[PDB]
Amino acid sequence: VTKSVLFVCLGNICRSPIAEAVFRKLVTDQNISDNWVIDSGAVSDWNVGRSPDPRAVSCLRNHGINTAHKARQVTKEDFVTFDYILCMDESNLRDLNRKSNQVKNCRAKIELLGSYDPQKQLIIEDPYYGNDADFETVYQQCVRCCRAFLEKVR
Incomplete structure (x- = not known):
């Protein structure tokens, strides 16, 4: 009825x-944003306090989306308070599993976001050392996975 979802990658x-911004848009378009607490966090602490990478921000803005997120690290409390933690790749999945054991x-x-992709691309690869087209690929996978995820979580 209210459900919570944390999206996780390495640097956030x-x-x-x-x-996070794609899901937040989706649920606002669907008029159910009240039924959702949405956040994103990092496996590491390297970028804590910083706003999204410039390339992430340009990608989102050119699809009409904006974000006010500053990076934070996942904590112990997050495994008790969130209903779904959706991450990007298998080392993220590993680290979060180790961490949940504590x-x-x-x-x-805890699941791979890519598990919900209709096109079956299981891993959303880190675009940090890549280029704008890679951020766009990440965006496109996030739309596909978030639409199919919202339909399944009832």
Whole structure:
């Protein structure tokens, strides 16, 4: 009825900022944004306090989306308070699993965002060392996975 979802990547400056804003848009368009608490976080602390990478911001803005996220790191509390933690790749999945083992009575389902892709691209690859086209690929996978995810989580 209210559900919570945390999107997670490694730095929380390129992928999960995009996933969060795409999902937030989707749920606003669908007029159910009240039924959702949405956030994104990082496996590491390298970029804590910083706003999304410039390339992430340009990608979003050219699809009409904006974000006010500043990077934060995932914590122990996040495994108890969020219903879904959706991450980008298998090392993120690994680290979050190791980390959830430290909590006991973890509430969150941890899954690859790519699990919901109709086109089956399971991994959303880190675009940090790439170029604008790669940020666009990440954007496109996030739209596909977030639409199919919202339909399944009832």
